[PDB]
């Protein structure tokens, strides 16, 4: 004459432990991971255009190291710099190396339009034993080593206007001879001021003749500088010697390009998120692989695991 | 846990319920059986699904950033770069811990809430033809076949039909 | 939504209710009417007003800051300045999104709570003289005119006055 | 044996607004309010913040004393506004660390210039140039003294100037870089003159670099601008043999709510504590989507266009 | 406050109850007494304790940082360092203000919830032998000595024992 | 009787606490706890972090070897405390990038100095001045060697020093700027001069500027301080014709928890992980309002003065 109706919920034999505001360890029926802590181990070729520098740093490819001639006029979305990289040319020092490296990487192109400078009265295409191309003495591909002609080095006052609608990035240098005899044998002058000037910016460099710790048996050094001329500006190179002249301008752009230092293999896959540790999925909101990221990536956190409850509390039968 | 239903008066989760999240267990002359209420199940599932859609797949795109690994020692500028990244990581780490803790707390309660809502709906549906035993079970005071038990689950239960029989059994 | 009253058993909002947020619709002998409960209405409004007091205004006063727009390209120093502001904007954007989602969830629940609290207050006041029909309506089992219904809204309802009549009708 | 019915319910609106919650992405509520300000009136209000419109002059141009900027002499401000139309009509000059000098001057918020009396003996003062023209005559920066050779001689200058005040003094000086060796001799009677502006705490040395630059206003020569700050009790020593653009006094440096903003919006007449380059915006909402650059009590910039906050219950319409 | 028990039907907090947070006050033929429900009392305490353990003692260790106070006046680098710290301090203050308000709001509700759950457990235990007066008090319709009142607190109250007496008094 | 009444209720306190919630800004609760640390002991604890009080010596002054700072030689620390009472009683010096040198030395946490033997042949070593006085006699910086002429001649200097260790060596050197040209001749017998501290990676050239500066301690001349870091396998070359303030060795650079703090708080005896310039504070509460500068396990600085967390129900007194 009576009946009983009971109401209840489900339970699983094996639940999951999650963290709540009230409890540090509470059991739930189901949960999902929110922190990605594993990587495939390799960088995917897509959808971002990767460029493997192999044995070439970004500056080495920019300057024109003989082993980096394969990177000429090349574009990228993420330049990958390998730790195995080395240089086989004249020893060079780049003031504010990070800024120039960052500036080239963000632009994302190594396009180089050769220009015709009036280097009359001086000998061009100077070479050195350190820079070797095709088993012959050579120099940086984008740099012109200006030496004396007929034991004379006339004062240089060259001009080059920016007639384009984009900024031109000029890479030039100054030679610091190790010995005073080498300074005379190459430039016929005791010291040569270099003044690369524009309508807004001006840059003057004084060569410092002195012996440096020999790298590739070269006691002398060259300092690398850059100048950016804006549309409608003109480039003036006032010099009496010791000038490592540019051969043109590099195109500077604005985009998604950047640079990453990693030794991970370049495989074939599609992963928006790229880390130095390898490409990782971007499904989870957080990651614990690397603080360095590129693309559509989860946000780096210090937590190793964070389980989000996707079910009720597991209250199994005793 | 705020409503006290999942771990409250119902302190037993039926591991045999595989067709849903919440359901019914009935006793009648015809025997004992088990059923599931899909409406209350889908209500809880959709709520949890909404939390996932707001989190999974909503990733930012950042291309060029500051240097985060330094080999040499530079000083003031390098210290600022390290401080910025560490501060950013610390703040996001706090947000991640709080979000996981907060959502999991709400997940318990919303699952607890749906259980209570199913219980309260059944009590109002039965009106005065049953009494709450206090353990999540209703003692129905009239001859209910396997049909009217389905009527309670389907919502097609007319309390007036059994009211005279039910009230007589209760108060005698 | 947690209490299941606003969209739950009362799954109908009275668009005609303009004098308050919650109320009663007295269907009785001597006609039908509608009234609004100011206590529960002002309760939810005050809570929501409290949320606005904590959000509207309270803005920071920042006079001198770093540069956030650059015409030329500089390098490391410029990159850090852009990174700092972009990181700050993303973090504040997260706080804004999370706050709105959390508060709106609380706004739904507290309004549901106030509705449910009004329903239960009415039930205990009526004691055993009425039954919950399940749709948010009480089937009062005694002849209640437009006076004693005002008494129910007034809190001045004595169940003993109608208990003998109400219990007999249910029997 | 009759009955009565009492029903309880809530209000509802015909259309309502859709808001975002923790559980659901689209839920309907009776009423809601906007939390992200994504509109501007279009003009910077003159109050309550003291605006100073630079018009044709950058802050550095007004500081140095460009002839078109003489109207800003000894002026105070809370937010200096630099216009994109600003240009220079004086000697072409270069300021190493231009951003820092612009930043600290803007933070100080004053262009007060108490003229000082240096002992410039043996040199010709108040130099003039065609590029810097006041009215229609050759002139120079108003706050700068172009010291040239006197009677074909430029004796070494080693004047002193103590800081007898309790506030730091900001001195603006410069070095002239001639385009030709003739201009170097014809102006200073020397080949190269080192400038050594030194204090009891800091020291600064600059070498002239004689060379041709791209002619700006037909001026191949350049001027390099440097600044030195002498602290209370400190002394200023200027040792030089030529190519010195001497200061005519000191600038007062302070600390306050003053700043600088780059905008091209009109300066209207209203009251708005929040100032953005897109125009002054209200500070009622907690967040804004107008500009990341702000001045005064401003809502915090976020990337969201709209963020609706529910101010009422869930809407369950009858029909 | 969501459940409406601490400030709802219970409009008086018993300042004399020093042995617990929630409890019982009874009036019977044998007199008046007071008791405490330790299960509900430990219920609120454990939940609040978990919030404290998640906050107290969990401090970060940071040794070398950026300069945060400057004696001289610099340019760009000094401005960036000040902005970084000022942004960081503002962000942490918002996290602190939001967390304190949220936890205190949850603390009010969970303490409110525990009171209501105790009330609902007692009502179901009494079945049809008592009526809710609306002020948080139950009018038991049978002679309950200090023993069976303890039985209600003990959970060992059988409504069948007093059901016949209670129903007779109610409907007469 | 035939009836009974059972009432349910909660506790209340005579004096409650006001806390802030989402709904209400001021609500009364039974009990609450403070979350913001706003008080300090007033003194820095000696433990568990190794404290080093500079007293009248700055970190750079102790590094260079000011006579009053000789007690800090080869000393290590976890937190160097710099006092505002510090002064200098030696040759006036200016350090370009002073913050960077202080930051790197403080982070290293050691003042270890391994004395090295340089080839200063042809020049007079251990130069002294009246300003730097030790034991009431003319002296100089302990870690710096003032090189003057020998027999009225200053031969060009070309010394070498390799980094044969597995750690980086920090070299501290300087350049002398004479106040008068006569002083330049009286000490170095040559007109002006150049010092070029170069390595296999870095290059640094400094030009002395002879000129009068505001004399401090009756010294119109100035000395500029520079630093060089040679990596394992690198070599240090000092090419110079005069005006060289030579190093006497190398400083060991380390990595650890060490840092620097400026405070005038006493160094007491206690155990407090948290150290602020205002003094050591407890780290029980999650937040603090004492000082933005902190060291160790410290609460996070907030702008709020007090933040009460409700540890009880709402106080509804009778
Ligand atoms: C990035 O930089 C690295 C390091 O500089 C380069 O690696 C070297 O590349 C050269 C070629 O450019 C390799 O030279 C080759 O050596 C082979 C023998 O290798 C063994 O012996 C050497 C010497 O001890 C070890 O270094 C090496 O690890 C092995 O143990 C020869 O077999 C090659 O010549 C013969 O083989 C080739 C292929 O069949 C023929 O074409 C030739 O005509 C000839 O018969 C060659 O001489 C050198 O071994 C590589 N390693 C090292 C450590 O130097 C990478 O090449 C460079 N990246 C790129 C893209 O070039
Ligand atoms: C930027 O580029 C410009 C391009 O012109 C350079 O200008 C030349 O710079 C050199 C070096 O400073 C100058 O050479 C010097 O010229 C003086 C004058 O010579 C002119 O006038 C005389 C008659 O008065 C004529 O006979 C002569 O042919 C010129 O027309 C000489 O007096 C100088 O002599 C000095 O150097 C010689 C050689 O070392 C020594 O033997 C002497 O003892 C003395 O020390 C010298 O010859 C040249 O005149 C400049 N040209 C112009 C047109 O001005 C800039 O130098 C260069 N600057 C930088 C920083 O890059
Ligand atoms: C290193 O190389 C650079 C680049 O070649 C040189 O810089 C240029 O040098 C030349 C030669 O001196 C300059 O040419 C002169 O330009 C003047 C421009 O002013 C007029 O034109 C502009 C534009 O129309 C107007 O805005 C302005 O108001 C003027 O109306 C000319 O006036 C000069 O003209 C000459 O001939 C006329 C007619 O006879 C005479 O009246 C003049 O007096 C003058 O003799 C002349 O053409 C040029 O301005 C320089 N700058 C640039 C950016 O090109 C360096 O000089 C060089 N260095 C060395 C040491 O040689
Ligand atoms: C900072 O300010 C001080 C003044 O406060 C300047 O000091 C002068 O510096 C110059 C250059 O160093 C000195 O000039 C030199 O004078 C020598 C002779 O001096 C004696 O004789 C004169 C009278 O004839 C007295 O007045 C003097 O007191 C001495 O008793 C000359 O022999 C030098 O010749 C050298 O330079 C010339 C070119 O100038 C060459 O042609 C020569 O071949 C030789 O190389 C020289 O002329 C001058 O004496 C100093 N005077 C004082 C009072 O100090 C600083 O120069 C200045 N520094 C800077 C960077 O601004
Ligand atoms: C209001 O809210 C605050 C929130 O903090 C509560 O504060 C706690 O109050 C209790 C009251 O008893 C304190 O309890 C005592 O803790 C001592 C050890 O303290 C450490 O461990 C506790 C956790 O166990 C931490 O909270 C604390 O910070 C320390 O890390 C015990 O030794 C005490 O033991 C008692 O009993 C033993 C045995 O009899 C005796 O020997 C002792 O002398 C003592 O009587 C005791 O348990 C607790 O420390 C407080 N915590 C904090 C963080 O302050 C308030 O209790 C609460 N109510 C009121 C009215 O203020
Ligand atoms: C460029 O211009 C600056 C302007 O200041 C000159 O700098 C001054 O140079 C003079 C000369 O060298 C310095 O004079 C020295 O002053 C010291 C301080 O004296 C204090 O006490 C007296 C009263 O007793 C006060 O009047 C004075 O203001 C100071 O408060 C003296 O102690 C020095 O004494 C010398 O002589 C005695 C003799 O017994 C010796 O024992 C001493 O050791 C010492 O040799 C001397 O009189 C003056 O201090 C400089 N001032 C500043 C601010 O630097 C430059 O000299 C000038 N450039 C050139 C090249 O001359
Ligand atoms: C300043 O000091 C530095 C450091 O001492 C010094 O650099 C050294 O220069 C010498 C000579 O230029 C270098 O010795 C050469 O090393 C290479 C590679 O090891 C050898 O091939 C050379 O041998 C040839 O030349 C010798 C000349 O006497 C012949 O005798 C011999 O038979 C060979 O033909 C030569 O030994 C030495 O490597 C560097 N050390 C460095 C750079 O660390 C520098 O030269 C000094 N400055 C000046 C201006 O001398
Ligand atoms: C800020 O700088 C601008 C640009 O130099 C100044 O603009 C002024 O613009 C008017 C436009 O009509 C010029 O008047 C015209 O000048 C030409 C010159 O040939 C003449 O042919 C026309 O008949 C007419 O008069 C005016 O010269 C020019 N002023 C200057 C100084 O260049 C503007 O005045 C500057 N100041 C402000 C407060 O904007
Ligand atoms: C660095 O040292 C070298 C070696 O002493 C210097 O070169 C020599 O300088 C002397 C003096 O001028 C000359 O006589 C020699 O002919 C130079 N060469 C050699 C091979 O000895 C060099 O000048 C020094 N550089 C600096 C900046 O001091
Ligand atoms: C200039 O020559 C270089 C070297 O081959 C090449 O990379 C570049 O594209 C050339 N520029 C042109 C053709 O405009
Ligand atoms: C290059 O400079 C020489 C210098 O005399 C000049 O004659 C020649 O015309 C210049 N080249 C061109 C293309 O003008
Ligand atoms: C309840 O609905 C189910 C749906 O399939 C149906 O099988 C069952 O017969 C229904 N019970 C009724 C209407 O009593
Ligand atoms: C909506 O809510 C806002 C904020 O509470 C209020 O100012 C406005 O009057 C309300 N409007 C309607 C139509 O409810
Ligand atoms: C109350 O419960 C206790 C156990 O907690 C038991 O020992 C005691 O007998 C009970 N009192 C009754 C049932 O009256
Ligand atoms: C170098 O010698 C000085 C003088 O005795 C001493 O202070 C220092 O500790 C020595 N260095 C080492 C590594 O012993």
Author numbering:
A (entry chain A): 9 to 326
B (entry chain a), E (entry chain c): 330 to 501
C (entry chain b): 330 to 500
D (entry chain B): 8 to 326
F (entry chain C): 8 to 325
What does the publication say?
Neutralizing antibodies target the hemagglutinin (HA), a trimeric protein containing “stem” (also known as the “stalk”) and “head” domains in each protomer. The head domain includes the Receptor Binding Site (RBS), making this domain the primary target of neutralizing antibodies by blocking virus attachment to host cells. The stem domain contains the fusion peptide, which is targeted by a smaller subset of neutralizing antibodies that prevent membrane fusion. Other designs, such as centralized conserved and computationally optimized broadly reactive antigen (COBRA) HA proteins, retain the subtype-specific structural architecture in both domains while seeking to accentuate the conserved features common to circulating strains.
Through structural comparisons with other HA proteins, including novel crystal structures of COBRA HAs TJ2 and J4, we identified the residues primarily responsible for the variable binding patterns observed by biolayer interferometry. To investigate the molecular factors that may improve or worsen the recognition of HA by these antibodies, we performed structural comparisons of the NG2-Fab cryo-EM structures with representative HA proteins from the BLI assay panel. This included newly solved crystal structures of TJ2 and J4 as representative strong binders, as well as a previously solved structure of the A/Port Chalmers/1/1973 HA and an AlphaFold3 prediction of the A/Tasmania/503/2020 HA to represent no binding and weak binding, respectively. In TJ2, the presence of an asparagine at residue 145 rather than a serine creates the potential for a new hydrogen bond with R73 by virtue of the shorter intermolecular distance. This feature is present in all the strains in the assay panel from 2005 to 2012, which correlates well with the most effective time period for this antibody. Even the difference in the absence or presence of an additional hydroxyl group, as seen with F159 in COBRA HA TJ2 versus Y159 in COBRA HA J4, is enough to alter the kinetics in binding via a faster dissociation rate. In COBRA HA TJ2, the lower hydrophobicity of S193 and loss of a hydrogen bond via A198 are partially mitigated by the retention of I192.
